[PDB]
Amino acid sequence: MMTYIVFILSIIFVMGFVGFSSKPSPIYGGLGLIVSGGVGCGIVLNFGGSFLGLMVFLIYLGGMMVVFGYTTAMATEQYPEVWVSNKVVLGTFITGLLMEFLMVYYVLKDKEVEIVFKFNGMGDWVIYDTGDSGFFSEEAMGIAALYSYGTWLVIVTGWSLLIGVVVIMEITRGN
Amino acid sequence: MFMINVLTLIIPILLAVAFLTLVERKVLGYMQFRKGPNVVGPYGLLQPIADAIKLFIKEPLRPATSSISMFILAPILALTLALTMWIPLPMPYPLINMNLGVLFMLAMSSLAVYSILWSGWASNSKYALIGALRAVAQTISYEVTLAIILLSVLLMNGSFTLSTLIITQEQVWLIFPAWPLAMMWFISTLAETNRAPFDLTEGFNVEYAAGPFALFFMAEYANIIMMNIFTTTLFLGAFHNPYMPELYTINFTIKSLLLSITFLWIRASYPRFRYDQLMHLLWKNFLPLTLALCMWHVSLPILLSSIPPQT
Amino acid sequence: PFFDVQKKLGVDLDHWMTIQSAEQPHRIPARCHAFEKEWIECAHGIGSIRAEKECKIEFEDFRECLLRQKTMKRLNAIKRQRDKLIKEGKYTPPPHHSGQEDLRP
Amino acid sequence: MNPIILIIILMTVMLGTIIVMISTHWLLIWIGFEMNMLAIIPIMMKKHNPRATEASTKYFLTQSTASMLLMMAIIINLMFSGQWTVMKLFNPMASMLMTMALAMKLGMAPFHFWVPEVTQGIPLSSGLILLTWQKLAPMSVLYQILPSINLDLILTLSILSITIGGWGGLNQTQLRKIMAYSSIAHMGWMTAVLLYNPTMTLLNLIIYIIMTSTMFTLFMANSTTTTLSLSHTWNKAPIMTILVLITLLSMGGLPPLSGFMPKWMIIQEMTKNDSIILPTLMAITALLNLYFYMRLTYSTALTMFPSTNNMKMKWQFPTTKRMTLLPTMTVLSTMLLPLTPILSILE
Amino acid sequence: SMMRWNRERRRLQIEDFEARIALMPLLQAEKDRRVLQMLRENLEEEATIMKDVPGWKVGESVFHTTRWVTPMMGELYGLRTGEEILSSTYGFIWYT
Amino acid sequence: MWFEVLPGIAVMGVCLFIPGMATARIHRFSNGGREKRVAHYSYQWYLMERDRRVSGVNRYYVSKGLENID
Amino acid sequence: MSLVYMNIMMAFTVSLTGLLMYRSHLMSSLLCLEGMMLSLFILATLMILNSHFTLASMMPIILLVFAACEAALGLSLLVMVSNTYGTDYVQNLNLLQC
Amino acid sequence: MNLMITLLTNFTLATLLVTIAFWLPQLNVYSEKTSPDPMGSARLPFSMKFFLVAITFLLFDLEIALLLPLPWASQTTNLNTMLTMALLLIFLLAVSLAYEWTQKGLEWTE
Amino acid sequence: PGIVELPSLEDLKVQEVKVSSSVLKAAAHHYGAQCDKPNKEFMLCRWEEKDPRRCLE
Amino acid sequence: VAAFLKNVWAKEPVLVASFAIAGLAVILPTLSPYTKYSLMINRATPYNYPVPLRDDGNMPDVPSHPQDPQGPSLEWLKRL
Ligand SMILES: CCCCCCCCCCCCCCCCCC(=O)OC[C@H](COP(=O)([O-])OCC[N+](C)(C)C)OC(=O)CCCCCCCCCCCCCCCCC
Ligand SMILES: CCCCCCCCCCCCCCCCCC(=O)OC[C@H](COP(=O)(O)OCCN)OC(=O)CCCCCCCCCCCCCCCCC
Ligand SMILES: CCCCCCCCCCCCCCCCCC(=O)OC[C@H](COP(=O)(O)OCCN)OC(=O)CCCCCCCCCCCCCCCCC
Ligand SMILES: CCCCCCCCCCCCCCCCCC(=O)OC[C@H](COP(=O)(O)OCCN)OC(=O)CCCCCCCCCCCCCCCCC
Ligand SMILES: CCCCCCCCCCCCCCCCCC(=O)OC[C@H](COP(=O)(O)OCCN)OC(=O)CCCCCCCCCCCCCCCCC
């Protein structure tokens, strides 16, 4: 059960996009994309990609999806919902989320194990710890090489970010 | 055995947050020439327990919520991110010893504005939504200088490891080569938690009951104690004997208490900023100095041949 | 329009990230350094049309090093036969695959 | 707009296209397309009216979808090849995705549904950039990946682009939408001859850019955006009257003009490769483009003339507008056919 | 102070790395005997499992070359228990 | 007077002292009277699993010295 | 091909189908577009960490940064639409039919 | 593994305290109350300044995302190139800040 | 393809160094000093042959 | 160029401090003698294995044992 955990997260990841590709609201759309970002980050972190998972949290979720929720909250005029005493205002939430985990556990059925067991990855998929690397994360040093090897990449990226600042300030003027 | 360690982290956090209210009211009492609470318990030691039992049986306001799910998930996220910021903190050895604990804490604190934003949209008020948007803009503003100051200090560390930050400061405190980063870091952590003189929420989560307000309240104070401990580890790092870890634990405890009382002593001393005045403080005062000191702490270990070890 | 400025002027703007067998930091190998090196040294300079049909063995070794589809197929076959024999009761697992043998070093 | 900021943004557009043109790496291809889009978004919003914001929104959505499909094609190439050289693709799934994404960036049918809208929403110089400069980078990537491009898919997109760019020009009085459907038809023409001779792709591209630039420069010289506003050119500047229309007789594809130079050469490369039906059908549809654009030619050089009285005041003022390269581009878009074997410089 | 102490910490890092370098021949020889032990065990249990299946060369490579291929995690730990697979492939990642 | 704040400060200081003392004692309890092994890098984890294999009781923190060689 | 890569591709195509069937809002379009970007990040990261190809580890961050800047541009476009009509509705964006 | 257990315990304690904070005063049969702020029925006007500071956060946060591997890049052999590109990124962050300054972008939230 | 020639279990048996990693790290620098020659001949054979099967003895 | 400097130090000391710190961060790594030692320490830090060479017969600059005279030595790093 514990072996297939990345695969399990990937299934949840797929289900997470069905949370918001059906598009119930842009606000619940942002909420589903935040949950999907967290579980895809779990997929990244379970291959030893620690810095890239923390870039998912720090830059994608805490950097950009904050701005998406911020711009969404400056639009789409709100309206109240059901606000009866606690047999509705939290009990329906708990029964709905228990049905959501019921849906998560419900898809691991006989139509799934014909794909899981015929194409068993866990046992031979996650091979990032194949031998020794040394005193360094290879992924950390590969990201560190952006400054010595990636001179042109850093030039065009910083130029695109400066042009991004200029472009946003020109189009958001109205004059 | 590990679950025992998680409980012995998280239960004393909640007890320390409970008695921080007593320490705040007593220290703000004596600084305002008055006394703080002394009637309820002996010298006030039952005032947090009485306040907690009062807030946890107070009537829910029957809130006209714009959403159920964000109304529930804002205190849940607030408490979860209040607790999970503590697990890489080296005291002198953390609960979760990870190689990127600094970046982990920066990420989990950058995720902490969703509790504000979801509390704001989960209210029906447009005024509460405007206050929440102002608070979110303030917090993500000061997260910029959190990240740049933190990067500039860790150019002397070698890596994002918090336990390595104890090894870095065994000869000198890191406030000596980095005191402008220290003072701007301290004002930036003051402005993260919406703490005075940056508390324009008392100048967004009032849609909640008194119980969920106590949850946001205790998450805010856990963030206050946590950022004081993180500043203590980051600039005033204590001596560590590996055969007696209680020397380091008592030393950073005393320094963390002094820095938390320094928050309590700042809030009883200054008027509040106007909102554009603290946006002026960030974007026009702290950010040029912070970028210049980032350039300085990049280029300075290269010119002094003091580049810290990677491992 | 492929204006090869990087070969005209003699600059290295993006050749270093292109293949796995290039100069990596701290001499880290890729997982398929030998297979990609052999596909590149086979298919070098002869063009794509000859490279498709005259270096297919090295290219399939490198593709199978990347995806490991034949190796996962073989391991699924052996594990399926092992599961069927444990289910039939015609086979017993060894002690060195059950966890009672006090590993080598 | 601040003119220094305009110069910086236009050099950033040119820089993004150059980064797509010179790079041996797929990440820099994607970076150059991102830089090109990011920089061209304020060019569309030069006037700050709601039609430009709508046009920029539609352009952002289509080009962003094409950029993400391009990155998915790059990622699938890195699966099945483990490398990053801008060369042939090593999966026909990644080949199909990159062909679809470059057809979206060019606005080839059935991804053409943003081209007559956005060109309608923006000014004439930004439409000139959108229909001349923004073709150069995806056609360069198509030039560099043609050993993997599926034959049936590129021919389907080519003939569908030529038919839809043909039947789009009937119901239009707007000059910019007519230039947009002419764009769609000519991109079908360029990608028709791509897997047979890409030198004729570059010849068709250069002749198309010269003719489109002549037409948009004439539209900027006369400040006319509709057919009915173009119809007053005979009374204001009579030398402007025919140059638009011999350039548009070129754009239809008609001898002895140089706009007959691409299509004929395209047919000249497709009857070599034993395709007789397909260039026949495509150039019959080009005659349908001649049908509608010749109706516009009849509109301007003939029947629907009449003027208004305020035109009498415009007679007392010359054009102080910069008609930059307009005599040069008008000569190069008509009289280049006796120099047709110059095309060997595009090998 | 940070100058003197970062220089001393760099000297200590070089001392630890030279300890690693002095130990790497023994660790590499034990790693070679480790992987060859496990592949010989997988080969013998493959030879005693794949009897009923026709057309099965035991120990047949999937690569057409005869060069030594660095073995995958399933070529070593495939026919073993699940806890050893977990300690092999998520041990370093899940370690605290 | 001013020393009246000291019982609350003392209680809060004990509440901050308990987690660090607790995790130090648990690390010494679960690792044979010593510190927990820090494996930030692949070499540290490789030596750690080599210790776990040479100890024979599936525990990395049982150190086998010169008595295990002849 | 492989399994978890097929899952990340399935998420990419699901967010593509959500990006190709608009319901009401432009923010829904930008969210489906950034879910596509997220799935591209995840799949690129798993490939680059799988092959141990070291220099490409800076590539997903690059794939983040540009595209996040791209999202910023999209948000600004939405804002200007919401400054003209009051809503971000895609049916207010139909003046270019003529 | 220990991290997932710790996150799960923190999430369980958070959900438990929220559940106690909602269900414990709903034992009370206090009163069902009626008759439902600085606006009564006003819509929300958009503010351009808040969106400008949000996008300014996002663009400088991307520049910080580039600046993050510097404590690792200090360990490289090509220190002249590394120092030039580090100073170039922080200088471009400063040029973005100066352009945000002079075009009145930092005004009324300065 | 050809059958990969894995050596036998008897060709792999050796008297192991059954000491822990702190024993090896405390005894690291003197081991690098005094056990230089067979260690470097082994690692030269290991980087030249690129195959542990030919690097056994 | 001096009265302007006193004026900007009076009005805006934050930007003067920022431009002074940034200017020193630019110029001082080149005006320093200790900058080369950063390069030397980062290139003498052994992250990999020092793979030995087959002795062909004529290599005087390459030692046979770590305790030999020839070879790159770090006496400067130990002493400084
Ligand atoms: C880590 C432990 C704690 C660390 C120390 C912090 C504890 C002390 C806290 C005290 C109480 C704070 C109360 C709230 C403060 C908020 C208000 C405030 O102070 O705002 C910041 C104020 C703001 O100033 P202001 O608001 O008065 O400015 C007005 C600005 N105009 C004119 C544009 C309107 O100051 C700063 O921003 C300075 C930050 C620190 C600068 C450090 C510079 C170091 C020296 C550099 C070199 C200079 C010389 C040149 C080169 C020479 C080379 C030889
Ligand atoms: C609205 C929903 C509910 C809201 C409240 C709850 C969710 C939000 C608050 C909690 C956020 C959870 C964050 C989880 C990951 C944190 C980052 C991380 O794992 O960093 C630590 C570490 C990297 O450090 P390193 O030392 O390199 O690793 C060991 C290497 N020897 O890496 C490791 O140690 C890796 C350990 C294994 C991987 C852990 C995966 C966790 C499960 C997936 C994500 C779960 C959350 C999904 C939803 C998020 C919504 C924001
Ligand atoms: C193998 C081949 C490789 C590729 C070869 C080269 C391809 C070149 C493609 C050129 C595309 C050019 C697009 C337009 C120029 C870009 C900048 C621009 O738009 O400048 C026009 C400028 C704007 O001024 P503005 O004030 O905005 O005017 C609007 C009203 N206020 O001013 C005006 O609006 C004034 C009006 C006249 C503008 C004329 C611009 C003509 C430029 C193209 C010339 C022909 C193409 C180059 C030569 C042949 C090569 C294909
Ligand atoms: C890490 C440090 C954490 C420290 C946390 C605790 C801080 C406070 C420390 C203790 C402070 C004093 C506590 C006692 C206050 C006074 C209680 C009392 O005696 O109240 C009297 C009241 C009336 O009773 P009656 O008999 O009528 O009196 C008339 C006289 N014959 O009778 C009653 O009220 C009934 C008896 C009630 C007794 C309650 C005592 C307090 C309970 C505290 C619980 C938590 C303690 C810590 C737990 C974790 C550590 C073990
Ligand atoms: C070359 C080294 C690297 C340089 C790049 C990195 C710098 C790090 C800091 C980045 C700062 C980014 C933002 C800078 C904006 C500058 C323009 C500016 O602020 O102009 C306005 C200001 C007048 O003030 P005012 O408009 O009233 O302010 C509003 C509140 N009252 O005008 C002023 O206050 C004048 C400010 C400009 C002149 C400052 C001169 C400082 C000189 C220090 C000594 C010499 C340092 C050597 C380098 C030369 C620098 C000029």
Side-chain angles (χ1 to χ4, degrees), chain A residues 70-71 74 86 147 169-170, chain H residues 22-23 47 50-51 66 99:
Chain A
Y70 193 86
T71 308
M74 300 185 76
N86 208 2
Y147 294 93
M169 295 186 77
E170 291 294 327
Chain H
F22 282 110
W23 285 96
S47 180
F50 290 156
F51 183 72
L66 292 177
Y99 187 77

Side-chain angles (χ1 to χ4, degrees), chain B residues 19 42 45-46, chain F residues 11 14-15 18:
Chain B
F19 286 96
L45 268 295
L46 275 304
Chain F
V11 169
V14 173
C15 292
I18 287 171

Side-chain angles (χ1 to χ4, degrees), chain J residues 20-36:
Chain J
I21 290 168
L24 289 176
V26 169
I27 61 96
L28 191 56
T30 63
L31 276 71
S32 177
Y34 292 163
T35 307
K36 184 174 86 273

Side-chain angles (χ1 to χ4, degrees), chain B residues 104-287:
Chain B
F104 171 75
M105 286 178 69
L106 190 63
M108 296 298 107
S109 70
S110 68
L111 294 179
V113 299
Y114 292 111
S115 67
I116 300 166
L117 186 64
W118 295 348
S119 67
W121 187 68
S123 66
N124 283 318
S125 179
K126 300 294 189 291
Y127 181 73
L129 184 62
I130 289 169
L133 291 167
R134 290 173 65 194
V136 168
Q138 173 182 0
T139 310
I140 68 176
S141 294
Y142 282 88
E143 285 176 359
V144 175
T145 51
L146 257 67
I148 303 172
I149 288 166
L150 184 59
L151 190 149
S152 304
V153 174
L154 267 70
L155 289 162
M156 293 178 285
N157 195 6
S159 64
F160 298 100
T161 302
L162 279 167
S163 296
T164 301
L165 189 63
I166 297 172
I167 299 170
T168 303
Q169 314 185 12
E170 287 190 356
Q171 298 297 323
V172 71
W173 283 348
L174 204 59
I175 196 167
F176 288 96
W179 62 266
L181 296 174
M183 60 197 289
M184 288 186 289
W185 174 261
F186 188 72
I187 302 302
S188 296
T189 59
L190 187 61
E192 280 288 321
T193 63
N194 294 319
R195 190 70 179 176
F198 302 99
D199 51 351
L200 292 173
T201 64
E202 291 178 351
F204 62 95
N205 52 4
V206 294
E207 186 68 27
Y208 290 84
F213 181 76
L215 298 174
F216 284 112
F217 186 77
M218 71 198 291
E220 181 183 0
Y221 283 4
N223 286 321
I224 288 170
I225 301 170
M226 179 271 303
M227 294 306 288
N228 291 317
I229 292 173
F230 182 59
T231 306
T232 296
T233 302
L234 208 158
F235 291 114
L236 299 175
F239 175 74
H240 170 66
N241 191 3
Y243 291 95
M244 293 178 75
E246 287 81 4
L247 272 71
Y248 187 84
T249 312
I250 293 166
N251 198 355
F252 95 104
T253 298
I254 292 169
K255 293 176 182 177
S256 299
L257 286 175
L258 291 174
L259 203 61
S260 180
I261 294 167
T262 309
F263 274 176
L264 304 180
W265 170 41
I266 284 175
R267 74 166 294 166
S269 295
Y270 302 106
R272 292 189 296 272
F273 287 100
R274 193 170 65 243
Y275 185 76
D276 64 338
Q277 287 175 352
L278 64 142
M279 291 296 106
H280 179 82
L281 183 61
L282 183 86
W283 295 103
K284 294 191 176 183
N285 296 115
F286 283 171
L287 192 59

